[PDB]
Amino acid sequence: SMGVQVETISPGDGRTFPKRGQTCVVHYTGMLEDGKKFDSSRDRNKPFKFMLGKQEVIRGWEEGVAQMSVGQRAKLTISPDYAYGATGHPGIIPPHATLVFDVELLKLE
Amino acid sequence: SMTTNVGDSTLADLLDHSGSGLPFLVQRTVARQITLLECVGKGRYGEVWRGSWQGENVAVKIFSSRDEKSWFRETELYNTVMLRHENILGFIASDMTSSTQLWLITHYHEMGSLYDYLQLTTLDTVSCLRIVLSIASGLAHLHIEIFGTQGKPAIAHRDLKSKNILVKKNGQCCIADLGLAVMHSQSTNQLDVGNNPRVGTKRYMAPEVLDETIQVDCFDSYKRVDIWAFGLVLWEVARRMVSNGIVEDYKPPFYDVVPNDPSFEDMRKVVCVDQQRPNIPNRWFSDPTLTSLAKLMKECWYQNPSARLTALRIKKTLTKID
Ligand SMILES: CCNc1cc(O)c2c(c1)/C=C/C[C@H](O)[C@H](O)C(=O)/C=C\[C@@H](C)[C@H](C)OC2=O
């Protein structure tokens, strides 16, 4: 979809999709377009939580997870204006970076 | 709390083992969960606010539009270098929102800046030595390159002053504000001076900065600029140590010869043309601790930067004083 491509790695339940105000519990690995990993909740074995609609994560990560059902694992390819844009994140994400996230939607709270 | 869930982490847990602060993606989420509470600093750089996150205090620097390149530089440094030390301000997170707001989030030190602290209390030999030794320890840690995978480039601060030093609850200090820092690695001899048009605080500028003789492509030169400024901080602190029932009022360096917000020319005339240095109060020479600190100050203030001692030598000298 706009700003984020979702490639399914393994299906969710096909029925339970995140709604505004629910907390998404996920595992993720974030990479630059050249495969360089910059962050992974899997490496610290600690799921990551964010509330849908609170703008707590970049727009592409949120709108990608919104298209997933519980249990789904997917590769999200996020365009820069749906990520960290022209500034990037100094020392981590270069300017105008397309990001690749491997995300698993573990549960909703 | 009523909002606590199994699995919740404190900031200490999130900081527990790339970069100095929280995991990158956690930085935005924590930043956008902070409640701002009280303004604890304001200057040309912007503002600093005490905030709270899940019941924990944090400090939030919100940068002015004029100082966006300091936010960029400081964020870049803390994210690319593992900079964790008892006497260097602990970085937590950086975040931006689209005008734009730029935030840098750090540990909160309720005792405040050293500049303010010296105006609220006097010191004794224990508290004075603890303060100045901790600053020397932090500065030596910045200046020294550590090799290997758990290492760090050498770092020069370039804006050391009592307002950029915070007091911890245990009475040691930590050095803050790396927005002007420059980095160097011996492995490549690469000097990374960055892109920031900001200059150091004029009152604390070394002679070679004020007369523009500093060799701008030489990392060593930036370390010696820090040493000059450290000597001025040592003078500010020592004045507030009581000896024989006597103490000086808090004053900033060169309080008697330049106005508030001094110009480049004000400072160049005092420091370069007239070769003035802060005066040593006579009562210091009746106290062995202040006598030792006066000798140390003088060794930071040589007009020839090569004559100045290293941060490590300062640290070793202060470790030997009682
Ligand atoms: C009562 C607690 N007062 C407090 C407690 C604190 O934790 C801080 C500050 C104040 C910041 C004061 C402004 C300071 O003089 C200088 O301008 C500066 O910017 C230094 C450090 C910045 C980077 C960080 C964010 O500031 C603090 O952490």
Q: How does DSSP assign B145-197, residue by residue?
A: -B-STT-B-EEE-S---GGGEEE-TTS-EEE---TT-EEEETTTTEEE--S--
> β-strands A48-51, A73-78: how paired?
unpaired
The number of distinct structural domains making up chain A is 1
Expressed as residue numbers, the domain containing A106 is: 1-109
Cα of B53 vs its chain's centroid, Å: 25
Q: Among B110, B144, B168, give the residue marking a domain's end.
A: B110
| Token digits of residue B104 | 């840098």
CB pair distance less than 8 Å for B75 and A89: yes
First to last CA, chain A: 25
Beta-bridged to residue B94, according to DSSP, are B104
Nearest alpha carbon, ligand 1 atom 21? B176
The C-alpha of A23 sits at a distance from chain B's nearest C-alpha, in angstroms, of 12
State the nearest Cα–Cα gap between A91 and chain B, in angstroms. Answer: 4
CATH of the domain at A64: 3.10.50.40
Q: Which of B54, B88, B110 is the last residue of a domain?
A: B110
Number of structural domains chain B divides into: 2
DSSP class of residue B243 equals: B
Question: 3-state DSSP: chain B helix, strand, coil percent, rounded to 5?
Answer: 40, 20, 40
Whether B142 and B224 map to the same domain: the answer is yes
The whole-angstrom separation of Cα B237 and Cα B257 is 19
* A76 in B contact zone (CB under 8 Å): no
List the one residue out of B111, B88, B98, B94 whose CA is nearest residue B34.
Answer: B94
Q: Verify that B179 and B271 share a domain, yes or no.
A: yes
| A41 to chain B: closest CA residue | B23
Structural tokens at position B264: 């480049």
Q: Does the beta carbon of B163 lie inside 6 Å of ligand 1?
A: yes
Q: Do B64 and B80 have their domain in common? A: yes
Of A44, A54, A58, A82, which to mutate for an interface test with B (greatest number of B Cβ within 10 Å)? A44
Instruction: Say how many Å lie between the CA of residue B40 and the centre of ligand 1.
Output: 7
Give yes or no for residue B162 CB within 6 A of ligand 1.
no
- Residue whose tokens read 């500028």: B205
User: Would you call B159 a catalytic residue per the annotation?
Assistant: yes
The CB of B288 under 6 Å from ligand 1? The reply is no
Query: Can you tell me the distance from the alpha carbon of B104 to that of B50, in angstroms, rounded to the nearest whole number?
Result: 12
Pairing, β B46-53 against β A99-108:
unpaired
Nearest-CA residue for atom 13 of ligand 1: B41
Nearest in space to B296 (alpha carbons), one of B314, B278, B315: B314
Which is catalytic among the residues B67, B159, B177, B287? B159
CB-based contact B67:A82 (threshold 8 Å): no
Query: Domain check: are B269 and B135 in the same one?
Result: yes
A50 part of the active site: no
* DSSP label of B273: I
Greatest alpha-carbon pair distance for chain B in Å reads 66
Q: Are B297 and B278 in contact (CB under 8 A)?
A: yes
Q: Report CA-CA distances (Å) from B15 to A30, B23, B86, B173, B224.
A: 18, 8, 14, 21, 33
- CB pairs A-B closer than 8 Å: 61
Q: B182: domain range?
A: 111-322
Please check whether residues B221 and B180 belong to one and the same domain.
Answer: yes
- In the structure encoding, which two tokens stand for residue B301, read together? 């203030």
The CATH number linked to B250 is 1.10.510.10
Contact B239, B246 (CB under 8 A): no
Same domain, B232 and B121: yes
B-interface mutation test, from A29, A31, A50, most B Cβ less than 10 A away: A50
Structure-token pair, residue B108: 């909160």
CA of B166 from ligand 1 middle (Å) equals: 7
Say whether both B314 and B189 belong to one domain.
yes
Distance B107 CA to ligand 1 centre (A): 9
- The SS3 of residue B131 is helix
- One of A17, A82, A101, A102 is an active-site residue; which one? A101
Indicate the DSSP class of residue B21. S
Would you tell me how many other CB atoms lie within 10 Å of the CB of residue A23? 15
Angstrom distance (rounded) from CA B226 to CA B205 = 9
Last residue of some domain: B70, B86, B110?
Answer: B110
A8 and chain B in contact, CB less than 8 A: no
**B99 and A CB contact within 8 Å:** no
In the beta sheet, which residues pair with residue B93? B105
CATH number of the domain within which B63 lies: 3.30.200.20
Residues B6 and B134 in one domain: no
Asked if B32 reaches chain A (Cβ–Cβ under 8 Å), the answer is yes
Q: Annotate B206-222 with DSSP letters as a single string.
A: -HHHHTT-S-TT-HHHH
